[PDB]
């Protein structure tokens, strides 16, 4: 059997979201997209991971269970929810997959704020784990990065995390930023040259020096830096010192010979709230049963 599974990562920057949020929902915007006949079809599951969130705990749930019933017509069903301050993830699951669901958990991990929010459930016979986080920020802090990363991995108990579930879904502000002068970053998005940017993205070094997220896989990125935007609009960066950087991303660990296709993978461009872009990501899952 297959499911759909929905990722969404967002840091709303310390401010409530737009009414207009169906972008996101459905893989709309920038980047690896779904067509306009593939969003009709409303996901299995849906997993929403925020950063800096000043919206309560209940309020949040409500706008994302009342925003899934405008788009789909469906009331979906919280499954989980966890919070540590500003951080904050929920899993809604369609209603009719309720009896399907088993072993629910939930976990937080703290900073120096900063740190990671967990869910982890099984579907059938197949488990999932799902990780929202926002690591330390700024361009010299990559080594607290890597730190933060390695010190969520072995204190959330949701022997280790990476070989705990079916699926792995590690997602959020993981704030890795660009290896290059503002001169060049800013002369390459003006062409939208991004490949020669993401040879220097930190979190591409680091996977590639195998320093984090060992044997994890990650989308082909195809949109623009999700950081640092001028709010209001997507046309100008707010750099000046804070260089456009994919800092929101999402990256997926799963068990050998088990199916796991990415539908899309990218950022929306009309959610102009926050400072950040939010982030999506689809993927076909095969669960056993």
């Not at 966890?82 to 937080?108: F, G, Y």
């Not at 939208?192 to 993205?201: G, I, Q, T």
């Amino acid at each position: 059997d297959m499911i759909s599974v929905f990722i969404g990562t967002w840091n709303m920057g310390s401010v409530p979201p737009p009414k207009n949020v169906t972008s996101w929902f459905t893989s709309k915007g920038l980047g690896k997209t779904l067509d306009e006949v593939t969003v009709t079809i409303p996901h299995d599951i849906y997993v929403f991971g925020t950063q800096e969130n000043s919206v309560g705990d209940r309020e949040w749930l409500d706008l994302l269970r009342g925003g899934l019933k405008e788009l789909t017509d469906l009331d979906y069903r919280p499954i989980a929810m966890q919070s540590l301050w500003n951080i904050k993830v929920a899993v809604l699951v369609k209603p009719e997959h309720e009896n399907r669901i088993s072993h629910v958990s939930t976990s937080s991990v703290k900073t120096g704020n900063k740190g990671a929010v967990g869910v982890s459930f099984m579907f059938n016979g197949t488990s999932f784990g799902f990780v929202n986080c926002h690591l330390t920020s700024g361009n010299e802090k990559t080594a607290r990065r890597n730190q933060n990363y390695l010190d969520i991995l072995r204190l959330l108990s949701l022997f280790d995390i990476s070989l705990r579930f079916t699926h792995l879904f590690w997602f959020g502000d993981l704030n890795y930023r660009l290896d290059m002068d503002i001169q060049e970053i800013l002369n390459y998005i003006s062409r939208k040259e991004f490949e020669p940017l993401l040879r220097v993205d930190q979190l591409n070094l680091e996977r590639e020096k195998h320093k984090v997220f060992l044997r994890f896989s990650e989308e082909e990125i195809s949109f623009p830096p999700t950081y640092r935007y001028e709010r209001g609009s997507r046309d100008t960066y707010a750099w000046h010192t804070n260089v456009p950087s994919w800092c929101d991303r999402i990256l997926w660990k799963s068990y050998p010979e088990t199916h796991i296709i990415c539908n899309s993978y990218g950022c929306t461009d009309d959610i102009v709230t926050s400072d950040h872009s939010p982030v999506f990501g689809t993927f076909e899952v095969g669960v056993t049963s």
